[PDB]
Design a protein around this nucleic acid. Sequence first.
DNA 1: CCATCAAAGATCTTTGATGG
DNA 2: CCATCAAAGATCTTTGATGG
Lengths: 194, 193
Amino acid sequence: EGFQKRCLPVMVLKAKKPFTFETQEGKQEMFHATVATEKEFFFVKVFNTLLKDKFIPKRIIIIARYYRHSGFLEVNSASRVLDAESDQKVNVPLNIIRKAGETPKINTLQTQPLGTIVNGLFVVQKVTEKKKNILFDLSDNTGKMEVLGVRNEDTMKCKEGDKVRLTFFTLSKNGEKLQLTSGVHSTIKVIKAK
Amino acid sequence: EGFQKRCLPVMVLKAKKPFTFETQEGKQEMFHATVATEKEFFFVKVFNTLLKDKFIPKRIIIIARYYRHSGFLEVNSASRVLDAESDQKVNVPLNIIRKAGETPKINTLQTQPLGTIVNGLFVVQKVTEKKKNILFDLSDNTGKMEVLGVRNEDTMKCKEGDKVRLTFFTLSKNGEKLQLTSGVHSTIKVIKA
DNA sequence: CCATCAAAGATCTTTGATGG
DNA sequence: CCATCAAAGATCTTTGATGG
């Protein structure tokens, strides 16, 4: 928990493309990644985009001076990322690689604590547009949930019957009427069916 | 049973990727598909790869000047494939679409007549190599059968415990000791374990 | 830089497993 | 048999690397 100084050799399961978000300091860019050790996996927020070349699938790297909060790891300019050489292996079981790239079932998100990072592809039942926001009703075979997404050109093209890929969304509510909320680092891609 | 001039409306169940083979004049490309009417379904040999855009699942197409031989249909550059009108429905019952894509049980292949086209995914019992061909022993819960496959770098990687994908294989032997043979247009893929 | 084309990832559907 | 959902195949979309 908290800041982790020691080096943590990990394999990179997924490395996404750098995107830009907004803060009080103005435009900033980052990229989402998913890395895993032998025991488990973690979702990674990399605020330094110059490390994109260092994060590649099938590759083993060593991360030090990073942060661990709840459902993910924070890698920033103050951190250090190195490349493995020989002795470093980090064999990840088929189960972890699988569960890291899988969409969690809605019914399972009700037993999850608040602050859980939610990534996956979900079906869209109803789309309720708000002033500064867009309310999405998402569902699967195991149940239903409501997700608050950002309002933009792509998201406004989303309609009932489509799907949405959520990345680094947070769980703001659980149990009955579970809800997800879009954060600052969150990204949502709309997938048009048929 | 032969050359059919009259247009036959059909719905395309599936279309695989085009592949290359060798006979005499050299490389020739084609692809395997499956079409079905309301009455039944067929396996089609398409020798025109430009028809790949014409053959798509869920789409209703009209085929004319096509050859029906024994266990399949033939569509070449000499035939004509057009898009069916809006009044053209061709509604295929779920049981036909299901059966058309399902792997036939070995014990059922015994009752089938010689020349029947066999497509499906089977389990590998034992692999005995030959000179120009490979002998695959395949089995299921309903029995066992042997298939003669082509010899190449792909089929030599197949070992007991693996699974093979048979496409447009023919049944050369029925009853006891049933046998499948790889034809010129036949294709096989080795699925690992 | 753009426009090609080739390599890798994500998506859909039905095929076949799995539990009543 | 029925009902339910993920292995295999195919394709589009992303990416990445290459030539105009």
